[PDB]
Amino acid sequence: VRKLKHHEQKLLKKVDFLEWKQDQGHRDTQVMRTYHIQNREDYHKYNRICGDIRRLANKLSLLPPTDPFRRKHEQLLLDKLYAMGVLTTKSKISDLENKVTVSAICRRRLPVIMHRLKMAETIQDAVKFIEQGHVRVGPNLINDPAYLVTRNMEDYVTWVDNSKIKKTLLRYRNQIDDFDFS
Amino acid sequence: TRKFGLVKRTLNTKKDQRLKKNQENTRNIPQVSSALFFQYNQAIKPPYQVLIDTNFINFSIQKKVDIVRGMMDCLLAKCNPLITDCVMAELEKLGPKYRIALKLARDPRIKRLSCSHKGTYADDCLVHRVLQHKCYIVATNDAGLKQRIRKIPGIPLMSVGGHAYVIEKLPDVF
Amino acid sequence: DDNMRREVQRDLLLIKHRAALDPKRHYKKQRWEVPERFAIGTIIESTILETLMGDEASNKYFKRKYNEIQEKSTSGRKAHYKKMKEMRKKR
Amino acid sequence: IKDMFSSAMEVARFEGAQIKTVSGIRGEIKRALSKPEGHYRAAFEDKILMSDIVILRSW
Amino acid sequence: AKLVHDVQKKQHRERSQLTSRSRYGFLEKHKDYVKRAQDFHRKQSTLKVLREKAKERNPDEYYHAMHSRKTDAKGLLISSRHGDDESLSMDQVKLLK
Amino acid sequence: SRVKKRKKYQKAQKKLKSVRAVYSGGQSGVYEGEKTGIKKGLTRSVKFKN
Amino acid sequence: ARGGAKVVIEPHRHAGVYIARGKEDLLVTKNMAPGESVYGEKRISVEEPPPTKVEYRVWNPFRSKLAAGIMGGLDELFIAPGKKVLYLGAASGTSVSHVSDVVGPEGVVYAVEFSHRPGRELISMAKKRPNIIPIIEDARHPQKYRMLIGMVDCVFADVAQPDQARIIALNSHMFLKDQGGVVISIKANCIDSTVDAETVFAREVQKLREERIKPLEQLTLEPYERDHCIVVGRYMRSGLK
Amino acid sequence: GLKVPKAVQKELPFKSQIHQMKPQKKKTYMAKRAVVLGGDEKKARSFIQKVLTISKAKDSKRKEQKASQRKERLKKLAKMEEEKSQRDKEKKKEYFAQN
Amino acid sequence: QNDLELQQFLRESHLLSAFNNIVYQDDQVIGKARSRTLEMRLNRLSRVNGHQDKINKLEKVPMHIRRGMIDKHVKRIKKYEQEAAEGGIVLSKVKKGQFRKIESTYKKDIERRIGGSIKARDKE
RNA sequence: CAGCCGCGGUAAUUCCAGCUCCAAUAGCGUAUAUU
Numbered sequence A: 001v002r003k004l005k006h007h008e009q010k011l012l013k014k015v016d017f018l019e020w021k022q023d024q025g026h027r028d029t030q031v032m033r034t035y036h037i038q039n040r041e042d043y044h045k046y047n048r049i050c051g052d053i054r055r056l057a058n059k060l061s062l063l064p065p066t067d068p069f070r071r072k073h074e075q076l077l078l079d080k081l082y083a084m085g086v087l088t089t090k091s092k093i094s095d096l097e098n099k100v101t102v103s104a105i106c107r108r109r110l111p112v113i114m115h116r117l118k119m120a121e122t123i124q125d126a127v128k129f130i131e132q133g134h135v136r137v138g139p140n141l142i143n144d145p146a147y148l149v150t151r152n153m154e155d156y157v158t159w160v161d162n163s164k165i166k167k168t169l170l171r172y173r174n175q176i177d178d179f180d181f182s
Numbered sequence B: 001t002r003k004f005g006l007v008k009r010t011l012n013t014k015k016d017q018r019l020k021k022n023q024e025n026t027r028n029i030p031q032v033s034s035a036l037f038f039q040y041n042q043a044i045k046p047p048y049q050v051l052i053d054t055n056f057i058n059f060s061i062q063k064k065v066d067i068v069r070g071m072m073d074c075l076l077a078k079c080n081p082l083i084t085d086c087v088m089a090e091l092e093k094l095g096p097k098y099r100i101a102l103k104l105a106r107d108p109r110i111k112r113l114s115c116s117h118k119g120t121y122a123d124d125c126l127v128h129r130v131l132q133h134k135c136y137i138v139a140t141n142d143a144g145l146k147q148r149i150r151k152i153p154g155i156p157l158m159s160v161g162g163h164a165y166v167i168e169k170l171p172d173v174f
Numbered sequence C: 001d002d003n004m005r006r007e008v009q010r011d012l013l014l015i016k017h018r019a020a021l022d023p024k025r026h027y028k029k030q031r032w033e034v035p036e037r038f039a040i041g042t043i044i045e046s047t048i049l050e051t052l053m054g055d056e057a058s059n060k061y062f063k064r065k066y067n068e069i070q071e072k073s074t075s076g077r078k079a080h081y082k083k084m085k086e087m088r089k090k091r
Numbered sequence D: 001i002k003d004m005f006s007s008a009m010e011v012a013r014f015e016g017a018q019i020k021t022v023s024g025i026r027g028e029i030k031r032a033l034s035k036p037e038g039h040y041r042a043a044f045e046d047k048i049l050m051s052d053i054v055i056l057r058s059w
Numbered sequence E: 001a002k003l004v005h006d007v008q009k010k011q012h013r014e015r016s017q018l019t020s021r022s023r024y025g026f027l028e029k030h031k032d033y034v035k036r037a038q039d040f041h042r043k044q045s046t047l048k049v050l051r052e053k054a055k056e057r058n059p060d061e062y063y064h065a066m067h068s069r070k071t072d073a074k075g076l077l078i079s080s081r082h083g084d085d086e087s088l089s090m091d092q093v094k095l096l097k
Numbered sequence F: 001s002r003v004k005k006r007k008k009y010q011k012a013q014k015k016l017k018s019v020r021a022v023y024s025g026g027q028s029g030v031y032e033g034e035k036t037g038i039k040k041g042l043t044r045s046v047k048f049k050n
Numbered sequence G: 001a002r003g004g005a006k007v008v009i010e011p012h013r014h015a016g017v018y019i020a021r022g023k024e025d026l027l028v029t030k031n032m033a034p035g036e037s038v039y040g041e042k043r044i045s046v047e048e049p050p051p052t053k054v055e056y057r058v059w060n061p062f063r064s065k066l067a068a069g070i071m072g073g074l075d076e077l078f079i080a081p082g083k084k085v086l087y088l089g090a091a092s093g094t095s096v097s098h099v100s101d102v103v104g105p106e107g108v109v110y111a112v113e114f115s116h117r118p119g120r121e122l123i124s125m126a127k128k129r130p131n132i133i134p135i136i137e138d139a140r141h142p143q144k145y146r147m148l149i150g151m152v153d154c155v156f157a158d159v160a161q162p163d164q165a166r167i168i169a170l171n172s173h174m175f176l177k178d179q180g181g182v183v184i185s186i187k188a189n190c191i192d193s194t195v196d197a198e199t200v201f202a203r204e205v206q207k208l209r210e211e212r213i214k215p216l217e218q219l220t221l222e223p224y225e226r227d228h229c230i231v232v233g234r235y236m237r238s239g240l241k
Numbered sequence H: 001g002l003k004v005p006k007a008v009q010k011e012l013p014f015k016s017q018i019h020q021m022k023p024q025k026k027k028t029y030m031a032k033r034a035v036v037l038g039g040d041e042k043k044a045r046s047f048i049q050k051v052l053t054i055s056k057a058k059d060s061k062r063k064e065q066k067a068s069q070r071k072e073r074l075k076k077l078a079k080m081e082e083e084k085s086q087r088d089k090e091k092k093k094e095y096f097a098q099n
Numbered sequence I: 001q002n003d004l005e006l007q008q009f010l011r012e013s014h015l016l017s018a019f020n021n022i023v024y025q026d027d028q029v030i031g032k033a034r035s036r037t038l039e040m041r042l043n044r045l046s047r048v049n050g051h052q053d054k055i056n057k058l059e060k061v062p063m064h065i066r067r068g069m070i071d072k073h074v075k076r077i078k079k080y081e082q083e084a085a086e087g088g089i090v091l092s093k094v095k096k097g098q099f100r101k102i103e104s105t106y107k108k109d110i111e112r113r114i115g116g117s118i119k120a121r122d123k124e
Numbered sequence J: 001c002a003g004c005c006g007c008g009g010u011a012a013u014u015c016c017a018g019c020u021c022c023a024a025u026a027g028c029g030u031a032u033a034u035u
C-alpha cells in the first residue's frame, strides 16, 4: 500500500493490513523470535497453561485471606512452579498473576537453558546442536528443542560423549584423554 | 540439504518498514547580541518601542492611566506603542465585555504591527520578537510573561502598578 | 591514494596537532579528522614539517618541553624504586 | 617494634595499649618478645612500612 | 570566613623523616597511606572477582573461537604477537629475499 | 576607588571578547587568515521561530 | 600565511566553498580563470592529475560581506553550484567573482550595477568569467532588464539604500522563483542613521515579511564589520504562515 | 600492575581468559629484513614524536583543569540547590496555611 | 461515628446486598463481594492523601460507547426517580452534579467506566 | 565537629611568600520598626 494522502487518511483511519487488534501486538511472534520457538502453536499452548495458573490464582484470591485452604493451595502452587523453574522466587503471592508469562516458561526450554549454561553462544546455535544429536539430559539423548528443563534436571544437561564439540573443548584446554573416548 | 533450526517467516514488528512506528524512523549556538553589555542593553535609546499585551490595556483602563501619556510619564521620553495582530485578536476574542478596551486599542496613536504566525498567542509572539531583536520594551502584567522577560537579558519591562506605570531593567529611567 | 596519504601523512599530523606547535598560539576546539577527499596546495603571492624543523627556536622549545614531560613521566617509577631499594642495601 | 622500650617488664606493663603510626594506622601492643629485650609484637589494622614511626601517647 | 581571624588559619608545616631513619626513605603520612590502601583494595577486589569466575566456570562451555585459540603445555592461553599470518609461503619468501 | 573601577573595566573588556565577537576595527595588515581556525559544523546565526 | 606555504584544501559544509588548513585557516573558492587575481588576493595552486594545474582564491571576509557571513556561521547559503543568482549591488565585482566561483560554469550570475565606471570593470571581468552577465542598470526599476533576466534561483542584495526592501521586493516578484532564497546585507547607517541598529534590522525584517519573504536566519558580521547584518530568507509566495 | 595468579589464569572461563603475550627471544627474518631510514627521516621521526608527546600532555593538562573547575562549581550549585529547596519548603507551608 | 465496622457495614451494605444473592464479616465474605469491598476500602483510604487525578481514573472507553452507556444509565436513573416520585417514596438526597447510585450501578460496575459525575461540566 | 593549642624552639622561626576571590569607598555594617 502506498502512503495515504491527507484526505484519504481521514476517510481511512481504521485501515491497517499488518496490525489487527486480534493480533495483540504480535506478542506471540515477538516471544518466538526471542526464544527461537519453531512450532506456531507453542505460544498458545503455553498461554493456555498460564491462563489456568492465573484463573486458579484469581479464585484463591477471591477466597478469604485467613483461610487455611487458600494459604495451603497458594503455597503448593508457588512451590510447584518454583520447582519447575517458572517462578524465580517464592516470596509473593502476587507473582502468580504478575510473573507468570509465556516467556517464563520459554526460558525453561532446553536451548535457553544451554545458552544460559554457556554451552552454546546463541539460542539458535543451541537449537541446531540439539537437533544434531550433541545433547543429553542424564543418560538420555534429547533431540527435541521444546523439551522443558526442571531446576533439578539442570544439573544433568551435558554434552553427549563422543561429541565433536566435547572433543573440541577438551582439545582447547589440552585435556583430551582418548582412553575416556573424549 | 535442509538447514537446521527452521522457523516460519512471520512479521518482525521491530524491523519492518511497512509498520508506522518503524516508518517514522550542524550545531547551532546563537550569537550573543552586540547590543548588549554583560546585562546592560546599550543600543536602546529614545524613542522607545513598547510592545503592549492585552492585560496591560485592561489594567490601564482599570487604573485610568492613558496609554501614550502614561508611557511618556513613565519613561520621560517619546515612545511608540505597538499592538500586534495576536494582541488585537485576543482583545477581540475577549468578547463584548471588553469593547472599551478594544476601542482604546484602536486609538491611532498606537501603531499596529503585523504577525505572520498561525494562531493567536501573544506570549510566544512577543517572546519571539524579544529573542530576535533587542529594541523592544515589553508592557505586561502577566506573571508568567513577566518571568520570561526577566529571564531574557537586555529587555525592559513595563507594568501597571498603583497610580502609574512602572519600568524595570531600564537603567536610563531615573 | 594510499601512497599519497603515506607520503603526506606527517603534514596532516602537524595540522591535526597544530595546537602544540606554538606556546603563544591557541585555537578553537576542533576534533579534526582526515577527510576522505582533500588536496595539497601552495600559496602564490617545502612542507610544513621541513619548515618547522628548519626553524631553530621552535626546535629548542620542543626539546625543552619534551624534557620537562620526560621528567614528569619518569618521576616515581622503576628507577625511583630501584634507587630507593638500593639505599637500603648500601648500609 | 623496637626502641620503644628497654625491657620486657616495661613492655608488659604497657601491653594492650593503643599505638599509632605517623601515617595514622592504629594498632595494639600485644606481647613482649623474649629476645632482644626491648622489642614487642603489635597488631595494626593494615600493613605498615619500614619508613613508619610508631608512637604511644601518654601523659 | 565570617568570624575567623587570619592568624587562626595559619599553615601548619609538615615534619620530615628522621636523619637516623633516612635510609628507609620518605616518611609516609595519611595522604600517602590512602593511596597505598586504595591501590591494594582495588587490586584485591578484581582478584576476588577473577577467583570467583574461575570457581564458577562450566567445564561444558563451547565457543567457536576454541577452534582458533590455542593453549600451551603450561595451561595458559597463547596470544600471538603479530597475529591479528605468521608463516610465509615459499612464493613470498623468494620475492622478499 | 578610581583605580579599581579602571581595572574592573579592563577585566570586563577582556571578558566580553570571550563572551561574544567584538568589533576591533578593520584589518590593517595583509590578510593572514583565521588564527584560531574555521569550523564548518558550527552555526552562530540566530534563527527565527514562527 | 606567506608564499610557498603548504595548505590542505578540504570541502566546506557549503557546496562550492573550501577550507585551506594550515597554521591559519582560509576560506577559498575554485578559480574560474586560473592565473589572474581580481583584487590582489592570495591564490593557491593545486596540481591534480597528465597533471593539470588547478588554482584556488582566498575569500577575504573583511572585503566581502558574504565571506564574513559564511565565516560567522550562516546555516543555509542558497548560492550553490549550478544555480542562477541575481546579484544586486555588484560594484567592481570582487564578491561577484567569488559568487561566480561558487556557482561554477553551469551557474549564471546576473550582476546588476548602476554606476558606469565600476560597470566597465564588471564588463572586463565578465570576459574572463563567462558565467557573469553585467546588467548596467538601476536596480530600483527592474522592468528595464526584464528582457535580459529570466527566473533566477537566488537573489543576493548588497545594495545600501534606504529603500532596499522595496528594491528586493520588486526584483523578487519578477525574477525570483517560488521557494527561492534571498540573502540580504543590511547596513543600519545607510538605512537609517537616527535609530539604533537593532531597530533598523527589525524594521527591515518586518518589511520583508510584508513583501512575503520569510526570514529564516539572522547574523551580525563581527569582528569583520560594525552594525552590519545578513538576513537569509525564503520567498514564500504561497504564504509565510 | 595487577598480577593474576597462574592457577586462576588456568581456570578462568573462555570469555574471561587473559591475553598475555610472551617476549620473543630469536630474531625473525622480517625483523632482520626491516629497513630503517636515517638522517632527515630520523629527524622527522624525532620531531613527530616530540610534537605528539606535547599534544597529549597539553590535552591531559586542560582536561585536569576543567575537572577541577567543574568540581568547584558543582559544589557551588549543590549549595544553591539546598537553599532553593529550603525556600520552596517554607513557601509551600506558607501557601497551604492560606488555602 | 468513631466506630469502624458499623460505618463500614453501612457504606458497603449495597455491595453485600448486590453480590450475596448476612456474610458481612471479613472472614466469611467471598468472591466478588470481597474483591469490590476491598477495592472500596482501599479507595476510601487513598482518597484523602492521594491526588484525585491519580486516584480516580476511568477505564478507557471509546466516545460513542461511553456516551451511550451514560445516556442509558441516566435514563434508568430518571425512570427510577420518576416512579419513586409518582408513588410517593422518599429517597436519599444526591448532589446536583453527581449520578445517583442504584442497583444497576452496583451490579454492572458502571462507576469505573462512566465515573461519579461529568468532570468537564463540574469544572465549568 | 572542628583546628591561634603540634615536638623542639621566642633571636626562636622566614613559613598556604601576607591563602584566594567579591563589592561599596571617606565612607561602610548590625538590630528593630515600617511601604
Ligand SMILES: [Zn+2]
Residues within 6 Å of the ligand: B084, B085, B086, B087, B115, B116, B117, B121, B122, B125, B126
Ligand atoms: Zn503575534
